[PDB]
Amino acid sequence: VMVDEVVHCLSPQKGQIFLDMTFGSGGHTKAILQKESDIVLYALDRDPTAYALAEHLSELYPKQIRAMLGQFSQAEALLMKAGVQPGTFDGVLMDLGCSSMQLDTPERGFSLRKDGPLDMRMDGGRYPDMPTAADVVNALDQQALASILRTYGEEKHAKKIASAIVQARSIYPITRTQQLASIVAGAFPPSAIYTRKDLLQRSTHIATKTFQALRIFVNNELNELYTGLKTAQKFLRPGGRLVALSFHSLEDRIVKRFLLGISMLMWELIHKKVLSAKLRAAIKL
Amino acid sequence: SLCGIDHEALNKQIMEYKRRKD
Ligand SMILES: C[S@@+](CC[C@H](N)C(=O)[O-])C[C@H]1O[C@@H](n2cnc3c(N)ncnc32)[C@H](O)[C@@H]1O
């Protein structure tokens, strides 16, 4: 995503040190190494599958790549443990949301389009006690579910969907993605099940905002994001560059306000572009 | 913790549920 733009924003140079906080499939890390291989790059991801790809990459690039497995909230401890001082990095990249592995693997439970266990945990099986999306929709009460769908999913029909979920789970536990998708569609007339931007575009399933809401909750993505941003700021050197890619308004709003220092003259705001993602880049002063 | 949803309180509700399911 925006690979030419991200790399151009980071402007990597010989001898510089980078932190890729969202290694994913390695797309951005490999594009950085391709523009400049004489760097050090710390590659972090909370997802075992992505971290393993970074480890595999580190065998091709042993001097350059250090793979780490952890959440944004864990990054500071992982870095300090690796001997990285604050004020080290020339650039930090955050490409937010989901990887292709998570969305294209039915068993991970992220897609309404492919049936699988309603898991949705970005951490995979790393934390067996971490609640799944099934645990969320099976345990929480109606007003809690409605608050999640409204706040994290911006879903206007939060209450009607939350009621549908509690009704449905009373009959039988909600354990799989297509099951949940059809329970959500049930709270609407059969005609409203698909939305679309215009007459020619792809049908989008009505449960799409509910799935995003569940994913953000299960993975604590917005609270995690704020912690990752503070960690990015602490570990950047002055003059180092932060590049963030946002894919919905809630994360973009958190990046915007963090950069303005009005979460409650620290950054030079050098790029705002959409590409769908919104890229924001900034230089630490 | 910070975005209007109390993850700690809600997680504890879920963990009681998961213990009941054991
Ligand atoms: C949009 S994908 C990044 C894809 C990557 N840039 C590429 O080119 O393939 C987001 C990745 O960041 C990870 N991620 C999302 N939130 C995270 C968090 N709070 N802590 C650590 N990793 C996170 C996901 O696990 C996923 O692998």
Numbering used by the authors:
A (entry chain A): 6 to 269, 304 to 314, 329 to 338
B (entry chain B): 1 to 22
Paper text:
The m4C methyltransferase METTL15 maintains mitochondrial homeostasis by catalyzing m4C839 located in 12 S rRNA helix 44 (h44). Similar to other members of rRNA methyltransferases, METTL15 has a two-domain structure: an MTase domain (domain 1) and a scaffold-like domain (domain 2). The domain 2 of METTL15 contained five α-helices and one η-helix, which formed a scaffold for the binding of RNA substrates or other functional proteins. Here, we reported a series of crystal structures of human METTL15–hsRBFA–h44–SAM analog, METTL15–hsRBFA–SAM, METTL15–SAM and apo METTL15.
To further characterize the interactions between METTL15 and the C-terminal helix of hsRBFA, we crystallized and determined the complex structure of METTL1570–407 with SAM and hsRBFA226–260. The METTL1570–407–hsRBFA226–260–SAM ternary complex structure was subsequently refined to a resolution of 2.2 Å in space group P 21. In the ternary structure, METTL15 formed a 1:1:1 complex with SAM and hsRBFA226–260 in an asymmetric unit. METTL15 and SAM in this ternary complex adopted a similar conformation with that in the METTL15–SAM complex, displaying an overall r.m.s.d. for Cα atoms of 0.361 Å. Most of the hsRBFA226–260 (Leu236~Asp255) were visible in the electron density map, forming as a helix and lying on the side of METTL15 domain 2 surface. Superposition of the METTL1570–407–hsRBFA226–260–SAM ternary complex and the METTL15–SAM complex showed that the η-helix (Thr339~Glu361) of METTL15 domain 1 posed a physical barrier with hsRBFA helix and was not observed in the ternary complex, indicating that the η-helix of METTL15 domain 1 is flexible, which may undergo a conformational change as a switch when METTL15 binds to hsRBFA. The helix of hsRBFA spanned one hydrophobic surface of METTL15. The side chains of hsRBFA Cys237, Ile239, His241, Asn245 and Ile248 inserted into several wide and shallow hydrophobic pockets of METTL15, resulting in specific recognition between METTL15 and hsRBFA. The side chain of hsRBFA His241 protruded into the aromatic cage surrounded by METTL15 Tyr226, Phe291, Asn294, and Asn297, and formed a direct hydrogen bond with the carbonyl of Phe291 side chain. HsRBFA Lys252 contacted the side chain of METTL15 Asp209 via the positively charged side chain.
